[PDB]
Every structure is written in C-alpha cells, then in structure tokens.
Amino acid sequence: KKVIATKVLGTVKWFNVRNGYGFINRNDTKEDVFVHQTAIKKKYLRSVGDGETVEFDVVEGEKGAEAANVTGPG
RNA sequence: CUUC
C-alpha cells in the first residue's frame, strides 16, 4: 500500500487477459514490475498491450513491488 | 494476483 515511486515510465513486457496480470519493465531501472488488471485505469477494460509504453506508480504489495494507476504517458 |  506504500507508494515507492510515482510517474514511472515503462514498457509492457506481456499482459495476459486470461489470468488478469502481466509485467511492465521500468525504463529507469530495467526491472519488471507486476501489474494486475485492477491497477490499470480505464470489452477488455483494464488491460494493457504488449510493447505499449505506460506511466504508473510503484507500490509495495503483499508480494513485493507492483504497478498502480497505470495510464498512457502523461 | 508474481514471469503466462
């Protein structure tokens, strides 16, 4: 729930619509960050596409770092 | 709901 970073840019590595999650690779540190469908801002509402550039916050989830408030750049 |  704690915000670790804000307005981070990254590239969607993959996002699986069957399982409802994927990973975004941060452009600043080159680390993958977990992203759940519920963390994506508005059929497949709340999805992102592989290869897309997104902007997001990084928070500390139960299981480590995850994306929050995932939107288009800007 | 953590590398499909």
Q: How far apart are CA A20 and CA A9, in angstroms?
A: 21
Question: Does strand B come within 7 Å of the CB of A38?
Answer: yes
Question: Does strand B come within 7 Å of the CB of A36?
Answer: yes
Q: Are A28 and A65 in contact (CB under 8 A)?
A: no
Experimental approach? X-ray
What is the CATH number that goes with domain A1-74?
Answer: 2.40.50.140
Tell me the structure's resolution in angstroms, rounded to a single decimal: 1.8
Selection from A71, A63, A45, A56 nearest residue A5 by Cα: A56
Question: Does strand B come within 7 Å of the CB of A11?
Answer: no
Question: Does strand B come within 7 Å of the CB of A47?
Answer: no
Interatomic CA–C1' length for residue A55 and nucleotide B1, angstroms: 20
In order of A6, A23, A35, the CA distances from A19 in angstroms are 26, 12, 11
